[PDB]
Design a protein around this ligand. Sequence first.
Ligand SMILES: COc1cc(C(=O)O)cc(OC)c1OC
Length: 186
Amino acid sequence: SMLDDAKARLRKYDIGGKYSHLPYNKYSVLLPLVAKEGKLHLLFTVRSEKLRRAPGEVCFPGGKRDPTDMDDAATALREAQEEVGLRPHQVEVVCCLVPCLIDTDTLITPFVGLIDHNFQAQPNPAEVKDVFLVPLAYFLHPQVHDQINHIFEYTNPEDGVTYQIKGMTANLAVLVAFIILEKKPT
Ligand SMILES: COc1cc(C(=O)O)cc(OC)c1OC
């Protein structure tokens, strides 16, 4: 099926705990996959205007590891719960993708998780201004604007609201789309 085929594909790019012990400042992100109307979607947040780093920007749920976390996946789940209400029984963590190195001293580890069909986002307004879905297929033929560097513009046909997606967030979305959608019979 669609979901089982997505997980089998994702498991082949799983690096595991390989890079997890290295002595970095550590952050984790969740890439949440949602099935709606026969198709896979990614869930995104718009950061609150009040935040210190990157107010008003599109990003995945995530943040900094703390001493309670058993592992890097636990960081991602804890942060997703606190930002958009996502509970642990509502997410299956499928795999750990290649981490991102930033600023010489920081490592960001992304996890892909399948989200239960009955989940509804309760955004925390102190951290999250907005939550939205994008069809996974969009990342194969995006609408690109050059800022000189590449920015994606997505218009939700439900309400005509346009979002800008860029940087690490845009790169990870394209990656996940390639992994799951490349080479499929129609
Ligand atoms: C996981 O949080 C981050 C995300 C990004 C980003 O590029 O989206 C940049 C960061 O630092 C420069 C972050 O914290 C270190």
